[PDB]
Amino acid sequence: ELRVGLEESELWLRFKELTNEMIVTKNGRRMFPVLKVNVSGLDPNAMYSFLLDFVAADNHRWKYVNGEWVPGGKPEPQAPSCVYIHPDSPNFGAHWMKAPVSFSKVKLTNKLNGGGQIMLNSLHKYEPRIHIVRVGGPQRMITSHCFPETQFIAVTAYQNEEITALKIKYN
Ligand SMILES: Cn1cc(Cl)c(C(=O)NC2CCCC2)n1
């Protein structure tokens, strides 16, 4: 049985309980905290690519009002984000299970751009999600995992200074 777990969930829970924010920029900004995933139950000798994308958690625009995040009134459908391929992809089951899979080089942008960067809509709430794709074999297979604990609102600057403080404290 293939098992996927969140490394440093205790740190992510500190951010989640304040409402987490991630900066997005024209050229794209790396995430803190970084999504790190513990994986076991892979075939050490099978071939896999690790994919990261971001699900719009709701169809609303959010706004920071008298120090609290509140959803707009007017839902729009949120098309799914583009996928980021972990740069170690493709790789042997063994490679992925020997240390936490770390998405330290994904960059979050608010502008359609060349390559690498994932465009998110500013002031939308997002849930990180991975896909483990078994490649090369005859039977292709995908297993998907969500990380509720890692939810955030995409922002051009931090609104909650409690978030600013946590980011600096643990970076
Ligand atoms: C051009 N390129 C470089 C890498 Cl790496 C990949 C890749 O892993 N593609 C697919 C494997 C199944 C999911 C995405 N494609």
Swiss-Prot record:
Domain of life: Eukaryota
Positions of the DNA-binding region: 11-171
Locations listed in the record: Nucleus
Expression (tissue specificity): Detected in testis, but not in other, normal tissues. Detected in lung tumors (at protein level).
Coiled coil: none
Signal sequence residues: none
Function: Involved in the transcriptional regulation of genes required for mesoderm formation and differentiation. Binds to a palindromic T site 5'-TTCACACCTAGGTGTGAA-3' DNA sequence and activates gene transcription when bound to such a site.
Disease: Neural tube defects: Congenital malformations of the central nervous system and adjacent structures related to defective neural tube closure during the first trimester of pregnancy. Failure of neural tube closure can occur at any level of the embryonic axis. Common NTD forms include anencephaly, myelomeningocele and spina bifida, which result from the failure of fusion in the cranial and spinal region of the neural tube. NTDs have a multifactorial etiology encompassing both genetic and environmental components. Chordoma: Rare, clinically malignant tumors derived from notochordal remnants. They occur along the length of the spinal axis, predominantly in the sphenooccipital, vertebral and sacrococcygeal regions. They are characterized by slow growth, local destruction of bone, extension into adjacent soft tissues and rarely, distant metastatic spread.
Assembly and interaction partners: Monomer.
Protein name: T-box transcription factor T
Species the sequence originates in: Homo sapiens
The organism's taxonomic lineage, starting at the top: Eukaryota, Metazoa, Chordata, Craniata, Vertebrata
Designated gene of the protein: TBXT
Complete-protein stretch covered: 41 to 211 of 435
